[PDB]
Structure 1
Amino acid sequence: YGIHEEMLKDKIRTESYRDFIYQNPHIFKDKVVLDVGCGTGILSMFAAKAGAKKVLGVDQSEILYQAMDIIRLNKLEDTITLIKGKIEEVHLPVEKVDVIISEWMGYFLLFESMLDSVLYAKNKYLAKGGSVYPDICTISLVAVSDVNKHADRIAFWDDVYGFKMSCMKKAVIPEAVVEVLDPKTLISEPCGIKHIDCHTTSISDLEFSSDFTLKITRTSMCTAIAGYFDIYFEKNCHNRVVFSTGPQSTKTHWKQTVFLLEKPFSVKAGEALKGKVTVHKNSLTVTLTLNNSTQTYGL
């Protein structure tokens, strides 16, 4: 229940979906809509208000039972049918749907995300010529300078109440941090490392490598690389919608993902800082090469 309330109170998230649906009612009017991972049912209710003929909401979680009651309280049970289970194993009362909507995104876009279910639903159930939203997603990296926070996580361990705990550094570094960043600590322009169009992407595309260049904007000690993502509603829209989960934008419940550097290093404004990033699915991991050393991170 906690995560659902939190997601609902994320105005950037929820108003973005609302605005997309309500300001592009042509996408939904008289359509059959599938809401993958429907939670409390809010997106299904948006689609119904925008004129969907039929909305199918699917979720494996027990939250679905609350969604059943919610749909009834709003007198939408003749338009919205809820079905409990995984999309891969439930029985739908139709063979195809016109439109798929989902809020599936995890931290750093792909940590513990439901994208694999959305792609499954697309391939099995989306009608020829139908649409999936949000349709376009990107992931970006940006360089960070925060010597104080680095000292808080790392140097901290050299003297803990008079005792050495230096070995703990090796357990800290590999753990990606999810936290909202002070934008004043950003020291580069961002760089896109991944572009996903949900119509054409397959599950194998979610493991990928990218060379990147960060255009440094402040001479400083680089202490971490941060990651975030942008979500786009584009296809057939008269009113396009975008939101970013980056540190320069209003915070969301996804915050930002932070990959600490074991050994901070100096950079200069105007420098082109080059590195490489690879994401693997085992429990996703992120392998980063930068300044001649490599580290793999997990969440």
Structure 2
Amino acid sequence: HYGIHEEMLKDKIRTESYRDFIYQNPHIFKDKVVLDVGCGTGILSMFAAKAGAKKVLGVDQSEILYQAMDIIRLNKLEDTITLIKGKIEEVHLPVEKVDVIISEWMGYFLLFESMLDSVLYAKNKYLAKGGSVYPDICTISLVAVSDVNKHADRIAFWDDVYGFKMSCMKKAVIPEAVVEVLDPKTLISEPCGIKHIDCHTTSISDLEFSSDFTLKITRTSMCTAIAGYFDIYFEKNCHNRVVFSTGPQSTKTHWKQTVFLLEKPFSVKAGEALKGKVTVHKSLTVTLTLNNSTQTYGL
């Protein structure tokens, strides 16, 4: 329980990105009313207070909120930061509107078990006209993978299990998306963006989407999986823009990467433009069409 919060705090890419955004753009926070959606320990609320926020409201539905109360007091910030326990759609705030919303809401593959729905609710109910939401821009990308040894470990493995056939288990493991840090040497295409979200204009219905994609193959090889990741941007009104990626060419984060195993690996050639389609539906499911096969995956 508390160990999870510890893990997110120790994710430097995640936490230092938010810290850098806030501290390097204090003009965004100076004398502003800030709402921190799903505040956890309160760390983002304290960053905002340090950057000069007039008032910060930290909301969380979990028992961690009681720790946050004690944390805020230990740091002598109780006159700036007010904490409220509950869902953002149910709680009563002591203001009508806020100037800025900040939140670390992101799930695996951006949208699995994410709090984006609550952030958008907060944006629609509470954001002042001309206010801002951060991080403001997110993208999701796909990339092709060749890893014949790992595929054999997950799939061919079932053909002989201590002397017994277990082939039918292949059908059970294929639909399970995997969250894992990938060796960047196993990537065999350029990444392809499949989704762009601006939190200022995105609605809840935009989170169910379809995209035709094209993977520019960079290595002649057997394609055994498709991997997904996301990038997070702090852009609007920033003098110091901040970006981080959760892809395999970047420093690992707790989001790792998301892997969709192909039931039937197929050969590709460098220079090939590999076309497919992806759809994300509400727990989320991901439907992939590639090489004339379709499979739906879940996390």
Name the TM-score, length of structure 2 as normaliser: 1.00
Tell me the CA shift for residue 3 of structure 1: 1.4
Distance 1:2 1:99 in 2: 29
- What corresponds to 1:287 in structure 2? 287
Match of residue 13 from structure 1: 14
Question: CA-to-partner distance for each residue in 1:94-151, whole Å, 9 max, x for gaps?
Answer: 0000000000000000000000000000000000000000000000000000000000
- Secondary structure of the residue that 2:124 maps to in structure 1? helix
Equivalent-residue separation in structure 1 for 2:171 and 2:65 (angstroms)? 41
Distance in 1 between residues matched to 2:69 and 2:166, nearest whole Å:
52
Q: Secondary structure at the match of 2:129?
A: strand
Distance apart, 1:266 and its partner CA: 0.1
Secondary structure at the residue paired with 2:131?
A: strand
- Tell me how far apart the structure 1 counterparts of residues 4 and 183 of structure 2 sit (CA, whole Å): 24
How far 1:171 moved relative to its partner? 0.6
Q: Distance in 2 between matches of 1:5 and 1:268?
A: 44
Q: 1: CA distance between counterparts of 2:102 and 2:135?
A: 7
Distance 2:172 2:66 in 1: 40
Per-residue deviation, residues 160-204 of structure 1 (Å, max 9, x unmatched): 000000000011000000000000000000000000000000000
Tell me, in whole angstroms, the C-alpha distance in 2 between the residues paired with 1:166 and 1:68.
53
Task: Give, in whole Å, the separation in 2 of the partners of 1:280 and 1:153.
Answer: 26
**Equivalent in the alignment of 2:258:** 257
For 1:171 and 1:104, locate their aligned partners in 2 and report how far apart those are by CA, in whole Å: 30
Secondary structure of residue in 2 paired with 1:258: strand
The percent identity for this pair of structures is 100
Residue 67 of structure 1 is matched in structure 2 by: 68
Alpha-carbon separation, structure 2, partners of 1:202 and 1:39: 24
Query: 3-state DSSP class of the match of 1:195?
Result: strand
* Distance in 2 of aligned mates of 1:215 and 1:277: 16
What secondary structure is seen at the aligned counterpart in 1 of 2:71?
helix
**Residue 2 of structure 2 corresponds to residue 4 of structure 1:** no
Where in structure 2 are there 5+ consecutive unaligned residues? Answer: none
- 1:2 Cα offset (Å): 1.6
Partner of 1:277: 278
Aligned length: 298
> Secondary structure of 1:87's match?
coil
Q: Deviations over 1:2-23 (max 9, x none)?
A: 2110000000000000000000
Residues 11-37 of structure 1: per-residue CA shift (max 9 Å, x gap): 000000000000000000000000000
Q: Name the counterpart of 2:109.
A: 108
Superposed CA deviations along residues 196-247 of structure 1, whole A, max 9, x for unmatched, are 0000000000000000000000000000000000000000000000000000
Written as runs of structure 1 = structure 2, the 5 A alignment for 1:208-227 is 208-227=209-228
Q: Unpaired runs of 5+ in structure 1? A: none
**Distance in 2 separating the partners of 1:139 and 1:5:** 26
Residues 238-271 of structure 1, C-alpha deviations (whole Å, 9 max, x = no match):
0000000000000000000000000000000000
Aligned counterpart, 2:77 = 76
Question: Distance in 1 between the 2:202 and 2:279 partners?
Answer: 17
* Aligned-partner Cα distance in 2 for 1:46–1:64: 17
Q: For the residues of structure 2 that align with 1:4 and 1:31, how far apart are their CA atoms? A: 27
Render the CA deviation track for 1:47-106: whole Å, top value 9, x for unaligned: 000000000000000000000000000000000000000000000000000000000000
Q: Provide the residue aligned with 1:57 in structure 2.
A: 58
> Quick one: distance in 2 between partners of 1:138 and 1:214?
16
**Residues of 2 paired with 1:110 and 1:284: CA distance?**
8
